[PDB]
Design a protein around this ligand. Structure first.
Ligand SMILES: [Cl-]
Lengths: 87, 85, 87, 84
């Protein structure tokens, strides 16, 4: 939603709860302009975690590979993995 | 895990990742993946955005686990394990 | 900064301005529990565009090569670039 | 308005691109971007702090703004739609 400052101001408690439970962003407007945004803490941290993933050197190309494994059901043995690591 | 308990499914890609890591780091990741992660896949990770929507990522120690929560197959699909820095 | 909801409600304009001027994030806490984040629109837009760059194949290495060009003063003629793609 | 400096990388980017996008990109770079570079683009974060990215059409323009010499350094030009 796009809500003017004073209206956000009057129902801040209500907008924060809505942002909390729907992850809808509230663009707070000042002078017909987008100044700040109410965003869910989970919403922001998932943007940031996506950034951390995407800046990892090989990550986007490997993820594409693992998704193709999923499509093929090319999964390895759990009991073999567990034996091989974890002492 | 109860009633329709989930299980781990490790792609070839992620096993290759585990093999590429130092044995130490690989061990803790496997411990994390089959215990904490399998039990709270929604809580111990964050959903990803943009090209990566549908996926999650959980952070711990020197590693990042990128996974999918496949509810139709009752699976935690491990797609890629990468090193943190 | 971490701020309870009532104080945000009181000086929200001051908080929005502050968030706008620096790019500080206010973590809003309702009843002793984190709920939402006040972020600058330009700040949010800045991390969403960075996502777009990092998602683009080869962008990360191409940018390093371009920075290296700047470091060496390895620039091309503007007149030639216009020529080859204008009229 | 600002001086423009086009890296060899960015010139090669233009060469790689479908001719129509390139011509549209160049027009953009020499006109509007050169007058309002702090506005048309958006600062980049994390490893890219210090850089700006502008987007329009199907092209994306990453650059640095050299205020101390009133100059725009074009670092990389990218195809917007491209993704893994
Ligand atoms: Cl196969």
């Amino acid at each position: 939603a796009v809500v003017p400052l004073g209206e956000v101001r009057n129902r801040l408690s209500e907008y924060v709860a809505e942002v909390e439970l729907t992850h809808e962003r509230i663009t707070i407007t000042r002078h017909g302009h987008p100044a700040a945004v109410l965003i869910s803490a989970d919403d922001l941290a998932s943007i940031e975690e996506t950034l951390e993933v995407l800046r990892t050197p090989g990550a986007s190309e490997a993820i594409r590979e693992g998704l193709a494994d999923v499509a093929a059901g090319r999964f390895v043995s759990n009991d073999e993995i567990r034996n091989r690591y974890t002492a | 895990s109860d009633d329709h308990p989930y299980h781990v499914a490790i792609t070839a890609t992620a096993a290759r990742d585990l093999q590429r890591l130092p044995e130490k780091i690989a061990a803790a990741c496997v411990e994390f993946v089959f215990g904490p992660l399998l039990n709270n896949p929604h809580r111990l990770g964050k959903p990803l955005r943009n090209d990566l929507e549908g996926l999650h990522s959980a952070r711990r120690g020197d590693y990042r686990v990128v996974y999918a929560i496949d509810d139709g197959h009752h699976r935690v699909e491990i797609i890629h394990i990468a090193r943190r820095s």
